[PDB]
Write an enzyme that holds these catalytic residues in place. Structure first.
Site, PDB file in Angstrom:
ATOM      1  N   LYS A   1      74.551  -4.260  80.775  1.00 50.22           N
ATOM      2  CA  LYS A   1      73.854  -4.815  81.920  1.00 50.22           C
ATOM      3  C   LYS A   1      74.549  -4.388  83.226  1.00 50.22           C
ATOM      4  O   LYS A   1      73.911  -4.288  84.260  1.00 50.22           O
ATOM      5  CB  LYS A   1      73.837  -6.331  81.742  1.00 50.22           C
ATOM      6  CG  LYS A   1      72.970  -7.123  82.692  1.00 50.22           C
ATOM      7  CD  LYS A   1      73.172  -8.618  82.497  1.00 50.22           C
ATOM      8  CE  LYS A   1      72.808  -9.049  81.096  1.00 50.22           C
ATOM      9  NZ  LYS A   1      72.901 -10.515  80.931  1.00 50.22           N
ATOM     10  N   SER A   2      75.862  -4.175  83.174  1.00 47.94           N
ATOM     11  CA  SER A   2      76.664  -3.906  84.359  1.00 47.94           C
ATOM     12  C   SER A   2      76.281  -2.553  84.955  1.00 47.94           C
ATOM     13  O   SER A   2      76.512  -2.323  86.122  1.00 47.94           O
ATOM     14  CB  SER A   2      78.148  -3.979  84.054  1.00 47.94           C
ATOM     15  OG  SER A   2      78.553  -2.874  83.261  1.00 47.94           O
ATOM     16  N   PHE A   3      75.663  -1.676  84.155  1.00 48.02           N
ATOM     17  CA  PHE A   3      75.252  -0.370  84.616  1.00 48.02           C
ATOM     18  C   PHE A   3      73.804  -0.396  85.119  1.00 48.02           C
ATOM     19  O   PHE A   3      73.288   0.623  85.567  1.00 48.02           O
ATOM     20  CB  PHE A   3      75.422   0.688  83.511  1.00 48.02           C
ATOM     21  CG  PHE A   3      76.798   0.737  82.908  1.00 48.02           C
ATOM     22  CD1 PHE A   3      77.900   0.964  83.708  1.00 48.02           C
ATOM     23  CD2 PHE A   3      77.000   0.552  81.545  1.00 48.02           C
ATOM     24  CE1 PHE A   3      79.173   0.965  83.164  1.00 48.02           C
ATOM     25  CE2 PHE A   3      78.271   0.600  81.000  1.00 48.02           C
ATOM     26  CZ  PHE A   3      79.359   0.800  81.820  1.00 48.02           C
ATOM     27  N   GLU A   4      73.158  -1.543  84.962  1.00 49.77           N
ATOM     28  CA  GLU A   4      71.730  -1.709  85.297  1.00 49.77           C
ATOM     29  C   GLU A   4      71.559  -2.642  86.493  1.00 49.77           C
ATOM     30  O   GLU A   4      72.402  -3.491  86.710  1.00 49.77           O
ATOM     31  CB  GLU A   4      71.006  -2.354  84.120  1.00 49.77           C
ATOM     32  CG  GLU A   4      71.182  -1.620  82.813  1.00 49.77           C
ATOM     33  CD  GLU A   4      70.284  -0.411  82.733  1.00 49.77           C
ATOM     34  OE1 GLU A   4      69.313  -0.382  83.464  1.00 49.77           O
ATOM     35  OE2 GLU A   4      70.590   0.498  81.974  1.00 49.77           O
ATOM     36  N   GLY A   5      70.476  -2.441  87.230  1.00 45.54           N
ATOM     37  CA  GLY A   5      70.120  -3.303  88.362  1.00 45.54           C
ATOM     38  C   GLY A   5      68.995  -4.217  87.946  1.00 45.54           C
ATOM     39  O   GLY A   5      68.033  -3.710  87.415  1.00 45.54           O
TER      40      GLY A   5
END
Ligand SMILES: [Cl-]
Length: 148
Positions: A14-18
């Site tokens: 999730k940390s790589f996604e907006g």
């Protein structure tokens, strides 16, 4: 001995996604929502961070299946979580054919991590460009992958 992606693994991904709380239309006419979710995203849909988490876990189901099916050596939870993140990012097809998977299946954990460095560039009219975001992504995946 089938593995499941941990909560920490989901948070990494999730940390790589907006987060997109509102359904937005893609060129091909489909809708996208949450963390790049499309299969059940429809015009006018809205999601909370909780809803987007659920949808991301749906999108990860075939990755979790693929990594379990493609990896024949035993894995730690961290190794599994990092490989799911990696496989999600590069796609199951590319993962199936990857240096990374070969090394993993040979029990060469360190070399598998290094192989991830091969997955940090894109092509523009036949020229290779390093993607700064993929360098960051790979560093995080490799860190987790190599944590006992
Ligand atoms: Cl690195």
């Amino acid at each position: 001995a089938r593995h499941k992606i941990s909560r920490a693994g989901v948070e990494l991904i999730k940390s790589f996604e907006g987060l997109r709380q509102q359904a937005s239309q893609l060129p091909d006419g489909r809708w996208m929502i949450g963390y790049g979710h499309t299969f059940s995203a429809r015009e006018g849909a809205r999601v909370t961070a909780e809803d987007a988490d659920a949808l991301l876990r749906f999108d990860l189901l075939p990755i979790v299946e693929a990594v379990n099916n493609l990896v024949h050596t035993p894995l730690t939870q961290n190794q599994f979580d990092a490989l799911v993140s990696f496989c999600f990012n590069i796609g199951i097809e590319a993962f199936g054919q990857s240096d990374v998977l070969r090394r993993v299946n040979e029990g060469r954990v360190t070399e598998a991590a290094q192989a991830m460095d091969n997955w940090t560039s894109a092509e523009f009219n036949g020229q290779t460009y390093v993607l700064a975001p993929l360098i960051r992504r790979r560093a995080s995946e490799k860190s987790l992958f190599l944590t006992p």
